[PDB]
Amino acid sequence: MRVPFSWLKAYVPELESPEVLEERLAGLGFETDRIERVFPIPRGVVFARVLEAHPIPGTRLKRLVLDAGRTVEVVSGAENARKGIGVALALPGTELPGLGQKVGERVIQGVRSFGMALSPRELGVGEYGGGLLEFPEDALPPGTPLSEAWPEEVVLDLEVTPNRPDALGLLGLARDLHALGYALVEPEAALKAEALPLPFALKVEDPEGAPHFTLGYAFGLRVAPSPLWMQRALFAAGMRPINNVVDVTNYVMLERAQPMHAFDLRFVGEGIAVRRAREGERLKTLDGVERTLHPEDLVIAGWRGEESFPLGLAGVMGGAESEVREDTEAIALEVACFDPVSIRKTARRHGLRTEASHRFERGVDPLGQVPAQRRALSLLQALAGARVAEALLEAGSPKPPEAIPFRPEYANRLLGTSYPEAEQIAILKRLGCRVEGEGPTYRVTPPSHRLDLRLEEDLVEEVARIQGYETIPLALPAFFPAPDNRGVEAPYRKEQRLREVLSGLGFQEVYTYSFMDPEDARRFRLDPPRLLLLNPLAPEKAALRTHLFPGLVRVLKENLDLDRPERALLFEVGRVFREREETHLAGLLFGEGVGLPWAKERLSGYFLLKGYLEALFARLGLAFRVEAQAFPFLHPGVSGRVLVEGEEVGFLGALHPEIAQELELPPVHLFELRLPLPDKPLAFQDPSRHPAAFRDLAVVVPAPTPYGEVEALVREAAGPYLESLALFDLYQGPPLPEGHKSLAFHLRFRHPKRTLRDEEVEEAVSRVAEALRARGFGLRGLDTP
Amino acid sequence: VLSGLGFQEVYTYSFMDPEDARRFRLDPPRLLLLNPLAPEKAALRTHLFPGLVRVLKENLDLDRPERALLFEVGRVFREREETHLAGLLFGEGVGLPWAKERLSGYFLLKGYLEALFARLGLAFRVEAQAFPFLHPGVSGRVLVEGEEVGFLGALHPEIAQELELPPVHLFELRLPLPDKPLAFQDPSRHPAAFRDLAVVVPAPTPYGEVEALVREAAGPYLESLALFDLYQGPPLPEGHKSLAFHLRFRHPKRTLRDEEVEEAVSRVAEALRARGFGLRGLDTP
Amino acid sequence: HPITLMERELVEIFRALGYQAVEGPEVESEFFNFDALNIPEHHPARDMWDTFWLTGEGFRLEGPLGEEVEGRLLLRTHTSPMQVRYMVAHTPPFRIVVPGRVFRFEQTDATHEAVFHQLEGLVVGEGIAMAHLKGAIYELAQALFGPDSKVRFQPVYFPFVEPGAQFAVWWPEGGKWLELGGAGMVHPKVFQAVDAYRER
Amino acid sequence: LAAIQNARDLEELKALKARYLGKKGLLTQEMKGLSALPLEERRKRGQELNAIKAALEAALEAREKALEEAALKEALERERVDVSLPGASLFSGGLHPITLMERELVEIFRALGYQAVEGPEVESEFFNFDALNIPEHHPARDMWDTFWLTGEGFRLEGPLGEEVEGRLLLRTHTSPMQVRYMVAHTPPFRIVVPGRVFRFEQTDATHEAVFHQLEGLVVGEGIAMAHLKGAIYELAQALFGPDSKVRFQPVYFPFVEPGAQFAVWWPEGGKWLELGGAGMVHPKVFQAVDAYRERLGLPPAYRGVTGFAFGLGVERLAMLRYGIPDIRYFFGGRLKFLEQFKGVL
RNA sequence: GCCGAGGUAGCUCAGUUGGUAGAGCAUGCGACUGAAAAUCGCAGUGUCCGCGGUUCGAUUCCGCGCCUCGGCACCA
């Protein structure tokens, strides 16, 4: 909020130490944002009475004649500049705050200005620099300093939460302190009203927008500026004073969450209608605008026989021209409970942020309008003289709060505590509750202002708040989890274990946003984004990622742009959205790669990253093949899709040079699988003890043929006793019959029992030789050399 | 980490045969058993490598593997009782299978070491110092974050022949090694000065020497510093070796007014002259 | 990456306390996200989080027991949506922690951000009391800032919890009272929604 | 290779064609009229200007663009690689099954609030059997077969770094460390101590020289047998899933009273696996810890404390779970055998 | 909704008297080069938010929207 200390001590005196308070509150739940000392009134600012105001010829200035207890002039330019009021004179030679400069005796247009009368900002009590301060001319003995009656102030910025709409007025707060042990001094503004008919009616049209309405009548108004203590207050809160009548409207708004408007009866007509604004209706909203209305808006209007006209936009602004001023002599005081959303939308539509709307959008004591009337009229009767009418116009019957169960021990079984019953009754019974119970279940009815108190549980945090969250002991639970919950961590750990291995392996983890710019779909030649944002952070952070590589490369580029690294082997594992939502693993290679630093030769490129893949896969207990299959984004000649334990989970390849050039960067190699990959359980094969048959050979096969082809054939023709099988030499050219490639294979046989009688490796080799012939694959010891 | 890195974990007994002390040329066993399981399982291990190699041998004897990069971390007893980390390299090593060329030997295992160390947040230097068991020409002791925790080298060919097996490379540190806490250096946004050079230095000299000199003469604004080319022979004045260095300067605020990289380079040039280390743009070409 | 260390560390701290870690969908659905957690619309509670509201055809939002969901699409403001997705699928008691990426409509700077990571969690079962959360949130302070660390509890407002509070942790050598998170005893209406759905 | 660097230097000829032209062209309108060009407006300010200028763009953007289509095509002929082919021969790596089996059991329990400390392999009679209520000439000493040690030099630092008086040996069980913990620290705590253990035994398929155990205890005020029953169960659940049972039968152990042997139902295994032996710690084990603590001027801590401890050989589970034949294998450090556990999470 | 500023390359950015629309840097090619750095000698990529126009280049101006900012008060 914005809490003036002295003011709060008005309702709860014996408070002392604003810091001890700030502490008290944050313990109750309110986070004080800042504390501020305000009102450093210079010694040189005294209180003068304006005697006369004469114009200084053909110019805008006015030559006021004052008396700081010794009649003196000062020439002002301000509009409010007139005889009859009290002003704040900054004697010549007075050092001012907001002014920065010092005042002195100065000559203005022919007159000798003896100091100068100050505006609020000038003095420094609020940002209003367009007008002198205005005090009742009888205020303080003409000439006494102002500091005497403007004691400095401590104001604290609270942070009131949405559930606490009673905490938007000093008395809501006060009431909470009272629960802790403080004495509540609720001001009794007992007025003197004479019974006579109020000259206006009140007809409510939409009762579910203004459930509870009230019109009060005070006439005989002597509108003047409001007394110092009241100006000190309004400013002290972060408001500006206008006239005793409107100030009493703000004062009580601040005192108890009740927004109220006083309307000059002049502009009322026959009575106040409260309805939904009819299409084509425009009002000149108080701050000076012509807000063209919408039929969803709720309006406080007046009518003259036929036509119905707008006087203020209900529960938000108003003012228009019906606003209270100098020549006011009677007013209709508005004090109603509006429906939060009928306001909350209307105010979020027109672009309004009023102290009064803010109050209504949260919610107000749906039974506090009547008491609010009295405060305001009694206040108004004192301050403005007004004779008030004992007779309000109450329209809308409100319903008293509902009573909650509350079993004291439930409260305890929940908190782990052991607060005695009695003690916890008092907590509520002195938070202002109706506790009508014999026990053990009590049945409590909350005061009208506590909307936040619906359930029994709302009640428990009430007992554990006054008591203190610092009285709930520490304890730990012991328990046998339910069977089905047992193991849910497993999918997770397997994914976390993958980042670990991907790491010790040799990949630097990167994290990229999940936002994709629609744009990339074309640059990276991929299928169009599935989801788009309704409120993107930027046109480029518009849709979400269908792949991780766009960002991985993007990210890479930005690194060349900044760090000119020589190589990089990153990896990422974020969420990818398209059709469904999946976890993906991707990473790119780049630069020189492995090898020797003082040796001109590196080892890198595709087979590097391809090797890092098999390295990884093996250490995963999984099977890994890359079969060829050009993908849109990859390079046509180096593109294949990753095949883990039988299945296709992703791709591995280079980049399409179109894009490489398109993105200013050089060759990159990458992959993107989808998780989770499978898990193959431990197949414990016991190995044999007897040696193995180390035989060997080579195959010719047609140039544009694949390795995984020859190899799959070799392996299943080799039979069961084959063990290893590794390509150890490749050949392109002659002595080969032009257009073939000799693939050399280290074979290896072993029997899991006796050894191998050799002629057996032979007949084995026979089938391999056979299936090569049965395919068009010649040999070394048989078909080409 | 030793695992995802690329090392296959092995577990060996903690019994040592007294015998090895001579074969492996190491200090005599500290504890002996009163009731050994066998004369060969008589005393306990002062080192892990005896067993690691032993174990390796038994694998050639049985599986004829082509390479192996194992590692072990058992308890070692001598004077006190410690945890040790050891592992040996062997065979052809990394490279391409259908390419006649591999990449292996000492620098392989030496690289796997720095790979490891970096991913550990620790500093790693191998300085030379022949150890009894290692090979005289390829033997140095491991220096982690300032300190000497172990060795890294080859095997003394006496033993290689003594044990029927070929060349092996190994190391044995002592645990725990240190832990250096996160020193978060914020990097600059302004580019870096990419300058470059080469030094002649006398043949039987070390890399870590030239490099330590270069680095502390480079001042505070040096960033990287990498050897990228070594040279043995002419156009060099016979018996020298040209070590090429990719330098790199960067200011953690404004950029570098160039003449500043120059005066910086001046001190590096200076300390080379002040040591007997000639250049390229100044002392030999 | 440091979020991984930081996340895993916090995942360990709690697992070590008997907690399991499940992970939820990033792309949520109004009902599951704020709604099921007692946050109906036109509620100044909706104003405490800034939602990226989503739009697109194709995406199939499988809920808890693989069944598809009726609701308005979005990017999860907090990881709580998964607190309920757990409760429909499984039976009590359990102690779980749900880590994940979260998304706010906010103005990126040195202290604020677009994307972020949270770890939330609950422990539901018969007899759990506030004392228990005080117990846990403490154990987290101990294992994170060592044996001279304190925890502080102050009430605060959250739609899904009653009572509610904000924990602050004393950072011994940090000298300051760090903020950290917000927790509370789960709200009765969150149990009704889970059961209402279960019955569906 | 061929059409790329040729024309990229050749288009740079055009970049140098824009400025060898750019000067003569900029050396007309700018040099004949800096201040006096808006006086020589029509003809001159339109001919050598507007006209020639558009050349400095069309030829720039054409040698800059009509080069990418022909050069980027030269790379489409080059990397026409065989996608499938053994890639770089990086080393795989991988763990040993005792590590998986150990770590798994270390997790199961840590997840239950337990901490893991590790003790010395070379122990000292007092700490090993003795402090655990196993005095000499006790048929309890006959339940374990000790490798008794001998050698000069070795300094056996005990708990709080102080050196120990006792006879040297190789720890039969990991319990020696159960006491080394209790002298150094104060209760309560829940800890598990894994490590290598050594027996004087006849190596075969089911028995062995060296082995690994994991034991542990939980001591504190109010701990009861019900608690060990609680834990040993949670271990059965997390190891063999939700249809697993535990069985407790009394047995004799010097360090515990009461004592028992747990057996765990292995649902799909159909048999009742054995596993370990545990029990509520013995009163005399608390006396020894306190007696020792006082020797070290360390106030006594286990006066009003209760406490259970359990112990189970890793080595067994590692064979039941990862289905292995004989115990010798692990220590027979064989490659093709070990290589089957490189893929386990 | 508001009152005034910035958005210049492969980074960082002053920015006007427009004449070399850059300067620090950094980038490429031909001699020196076993091979790179200094020197040499040579020229450059740069949508200056995105688009409407103006001079010769469109960043000195003037339009609408963009991205980043200082003041209007309540938000996991």
JSON list of N, CA and C in Angstrom, two decimals, chain A residues 55-84:
[
{"chain": "A", "resi": 55, "resn": "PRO", "atom": "N", "xyz": [-4.34, 42.36, -9.61]},
{"chain": "A", "resi": 55, "resn": "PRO", "atom": "CA", "xyz": [-3.54, 42.05, -10.79]},
{"chain": "A", "resi": 55, "resn": "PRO", "atom": "C", "xyz": [-2.46, 43.10, -11.05]},
{"chain": "A", "resi": 56, "resn": "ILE", "atom": "N", "xyz": [-1.38, 42.66, -11.68]},
{"chain": "A", "resi": 56, "resn": "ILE", "atom": "CA", "xyz": [-0.26, 43.52, -12.05]},
{"chain": "A", "resi": 56, "resn": "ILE", "atom": "C", "xyz": [-0.56, 43.63, -13.55]},
{"chain": "A", "resi": 57, "resn": "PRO", "atom": "N", "xyz": [-0.93, 44.85, -14.01]},
{"chain": "A", "resi": 57, "resn": "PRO", "atom": "CA", "xyz": [-1.31, 45.27, -15.37]},
{"chain": "A", "resi": 57, "resn": "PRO", "atom": "C", "xyz": [-0.75, 44.58, -16.60]},
{"chain": "A", "resi": 58, "resn": "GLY", "atom": "N", "xyz": [-1.71, 44.25, -17.49]},
{"chain": "A", "resi": 58, "resn": "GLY", "atom": "CA", "xyz": [-1.47, 43.61, -18.78]},
{"chain": "A", "resi": 58, "resn": "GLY", "atom": "C", "xyz": [-0.56, 42.40, -18.84]},
{"chain": "A", "resi": 59, "resn": "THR", "atom": "N", "xyz": [-0.27, 41.79, -17.68]},
{"chain": "A", "resi": 59, "resn": "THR", "atom": "CA", "xyz": [0.57, 40.61, -17.57]},
{"chain": "A", "resi": 59, "resn": "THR", "atom": "C", "xyz": [-0.22, 39.61, -16.74]},
{"chain": "A", "resi": 60, "resn": "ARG", "atom": "N", "xyz": [0.22, 38.35, -16.72]},
{"chain": "A", "resi": 60, "resn": "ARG", "atom": "CA", "xyz": [-0.50, 37.29, -16.02]},
{"chain": "A", "resi": 60, "resn": "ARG", "atom": "C", "xyz": [-0.32, 37.26, -14.49]},
{"chain": "A", "resi": 61, "resn": "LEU", "atom": "N", "xyz": [0.77, 37.84, -13.99]},
{"chain": "A", "resi": 61, "resn": "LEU", "atom": "CA", "xyz": [1.06, 37.83, -12.55]},
{"chain": "A", "resi": 61, "resn": "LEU", "atom": "C", "xyz": [0.02, 38.53, -11.63]},
{"chain": "A", "resi": 62, "resn": "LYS", "atom": "N", "xyz": [-0.05, 38.12, -10.36]},
{"chain": "A", "resi": 62, "resn": "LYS", "atom": "CA", "xyz": [-0.98, 38.71, -9.38]},
{"chain": "A", "resi": 62, "resn": "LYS", "atom": "C", "xyz": [-0.10, 39.04, -8.20]},
{"chain": "A", "resi": 63, "resn": "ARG", "atom": "N", "xyz": [-0.30, 40.22, -7.65]},
{"chain": "A", "resi": 63, "resn": "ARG", "atom": "CA", "xyz": [0.42, 40.77, -6.50]},
{"chain": "A", "resi": 63, "resn": "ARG", "atom": "C", "xyz": [-0.32, 40.55, -5.16]},
{"chain": "A", "resi": 64, "resn": "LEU", "atom": "N", "xyz": [-0.15, 39.39, -4.55]},
{"chain": "A", "resi": 64, "resn": "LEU", "atom": "CA", "xyz": [-0.80, 39.09, -3.27]},
{"chain": "A", "resi": 64, "resn": "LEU", "atom": "C", "xyz": [-0.21, 39.83, -2.07]},
{"chain": "A", "resi": 65, "resn": "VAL", "atom": "N", "xyz": [-1.08, 40.24, -1.16]},
{"chain": "A", "resi": 65, "resn": "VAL", "atom": "CA", "xyz": [-0.71, 40.95, 0.05]},
{"chain": "A", "resi": 65, "resn": "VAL", "atom": "C", "xyz": [-1.02, 39.95, 1.14]},
{"chain": "A", "resi": 66, "resn": "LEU", "atom": "N", "xyz": [0.01, 39.50, 1.87]},
{"chain": "A", "resi": 66, "resn": "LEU", "atom": "CA", "xyz": [-0.11, 38.49, 2.92]},
{"chain": "A", "resi": 66, "resn": "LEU", "atom": "C", "xyz": [0.20, 39.06, 4.29]},
{"chain": "A", "resi": 67, "resn": "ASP", "atom": "N", "xyz": [0.40, 38.17, 5.26]},
{"chain": "A", "resi": 67, "resn": "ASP", "atom": "CA", "xyz": [0.82, 38.54, 6.62]},
{"chain": "A", "resi": 67, "resn": "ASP", "atom": "C", "xyz": [1.40, 37.32, 7.31]},
{"chain": "A", "resi": 68, "resn": "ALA", "atom": "N", "xyz": [2.73, 37.29, 7.36]},
{"chain": "A", "resi": 68, "resn": "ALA", "atom": "CA", "xyz": [3.46, 36.22, 8.05]},
{"chain": "A", "resi": 68, "resn": "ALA", "atom": "C", "xyz": [3.58, 36.88, 9.43]},
{"chain": "A", "resi": 69, "resn": "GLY", "atom": "N", "xyz": [2.44, 37.39, 9.92]},
{"chain": "A", "resi": 69, "resn": "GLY", "atom": "CA", "xyz": [2.39, 38.09, 11.19]},
{"chain": "A", "resi": 69, "resn": "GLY", "atom": "C", "xyz": [3.05, 39.46, 11.06]},
{"chain": "A", "resi": 70, "resn": "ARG", "atom": "N", "xyz": [3.22, 39.92, 9.83]},
{"chain": "A", "resi": 70, "resn": "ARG", "atom": "CA", "xyz": [3.82, 41.22, 9.50]},
{"chain": "A", "resi": 70, "resn": "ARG", "atom": "C", "xyz": [3.60, 41.37, 8.01]},
{"chain": "A", "resi": 71, "resn": "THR", "atom": "N", "xyz": [2.46, 41.95, 7.70]},
{"chain": "A", "resi": 71, "resn": "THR", "atom": "CA", "xyz": [2.01, 42.19, 6.34]},
{"chain": "A", "resi": 71, "resn": "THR", "atom": "C", "xyz": [3.12, 42.38, 5.29]},
{"chain": "A", "resi": 72, "resn": "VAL", "atom": "N", "xyz": [3.08, 41.54, 4.25]},
{"chain": "A", "resi": 72, "resn": "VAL", "atom": "CA", "xyz": [4.03, 41.55, 3.13]},
{"chain": "A", "resi": 72, "resn": "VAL", "atom": "C", "xyz": [3.48, 40.98, 1.84]},
{"chain": "A", "resi": 73, "resn": "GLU", "atom": "N", "xyz": [3.94, 41.54, 0.71]},
{"chain": "A", "resi": 73, "resn": "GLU", "atom": "CA", "xyz": [3.51, 41.10, -0.60]},
{"chain": "A", "resi": 73, "resn": "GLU", "atom": "C", "xyz": [4.42, 40.06, -1.15]},
{"chain": "A", "resi": 74, "resn": "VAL", "atom": "N", "xyz": [3.92, 39.45, -2.21]},
{"chain": "A", "resi": 74, "resn": "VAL", "atom": "CA", "xyz": [4.59, 38.42, -2.98]},
{"chain": "A", "resi": 74, "resn": "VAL", "atom": "C", "xyz": [3.67, 38.35, -4.21]},
{"chain": "A", "resi": 75, "resn": "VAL", "atom": "N", "xyz": [4.30, 38.25, -5.38]},
{"chain": "A", "resi": 75, "resn": "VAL", "atom": "CA", "xyz": [3.60, 38.14, -6.64]},
{"chain": "A", "resi": 75, "resn": "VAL", "atom": "C", "xyz": [3.64, 36.69, -7.11]},
{"chain": "A", "resi": 76, "resn": "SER", "atom": "N", "xyz": [2.45, 36.16, -7.39]},
{"chain": "A", "resi": 76, "resn": "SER", "atom": "CA", "xyz": [2.28, 34.79, -7.84]},
{"chain": "A", "resi": 76, "resn": "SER", "atom": "C", "xyz": [1.76, 34.74, -9.24]},
{"chain": "A", "resi": 77, "resn": "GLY", "atom": "N", "xyz": [1.88, 33.57, -9.85]},
{"chain": "A", "resi": 77, "resn": "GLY", "atom": "CA", "xyz": [1.37, 33.39, -11.19]},
{"chain": "A", "resi": 77, "resn": "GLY", "atom": "C", "xyz": [0.23, 32.38, -11.16]},
{"chain": "A", "resi": 78, "resn": "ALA", "atom": "N", "xyz": [0.25, 31.53, -10.13]},
{"chain": "A", "resi": 78, "resn": "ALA", "atom": "CA", "xyz": [-0.72, 30.45, -9.95]},
{"chain": "A", "resi": 78, "resn": "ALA", "atom": "C", "xyz": [-2.18, 30.86, -10.01]},
{"chain": "A", "resi": 79, "resn": "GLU", "atom": "N", "xyz": [-3.00, 29.92, -10.46]},
{"chain": "A", "resi": 79, "resn": "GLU", "atom": "CA", "xyz": [-4.41, 30.18, -10.57]},
{"chain": "A", "resi": 79, "resn": "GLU", "atom": "C", "xyz": [-5.12, 30.26, -9.23]},
{"chain": "A", "resi": 80, "resn": "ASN", "atom": "N", "xyz": [-4.93, 29.27, -8.37]},
{"chain": "A", "resi": 80, "resn": "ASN", "atom": "CA", "xyz": [-5.57, 29.23, -7.04]},
{"chain": "A", "resi": 80, "resn": "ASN", "atom": "C", "xyz": [-5.29, 30.48, -6.19]},
{"chain": "A", "resi": 81, "resn": "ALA", "atom": "N", "xyz": [-4.40, 31.34, -6.69]},
{"chain": "A", "resi": 81, "resn": "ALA", "atom": "CA", "xyz": [-3.99, 32.57, -6.03]},
{"chain": "A", "resi": 81, "resn": "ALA", "atom": "C", "xyz": [-5.12, 33.55, -5.77]},
{"chain": "A", "resi": 82, "resn": "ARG", "atom": "N", "xyz": [-5.68, 33.51, -4.57]},
{"chain": "A", "resi": 82, "resn": "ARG", "atom": "CA", "xyz": [-6.76, 34.45, -4.24]},
{"chain": "A", "resi": 82, "resn": "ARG", "atom": "C", "xyz": [-6.71, 34.76, -2.75]},
{"chain": "A", "resi": 83, "resn": "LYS", "atom": "N", "xyz": [-7.43, 35.80, -2.38]},
{"chain": "A", "resi": 83, "resn": "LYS", "atom": "CA", "xyz": [-7.53, 36.23, -1.01]},
{"chain": "A", "resi": 83, "resn": "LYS", "atom": "C", "xyz": [-8.36, 35.21, -0.29]},
{"chain": "A", "resi": 84, "resn": "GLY", "atom": "N", "xyz": [-8.25, 35.17, 1.02]},
{"chain": "A", "resi": 84, "resn": "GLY", "atom": "CA", "xyz": [-9.07, 34.23, 1.75]},
{"chain": "A", "resi": 84, "resn": "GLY", "atom": "C", "xyz": [-8.44, 32.93, 2.17]}
]
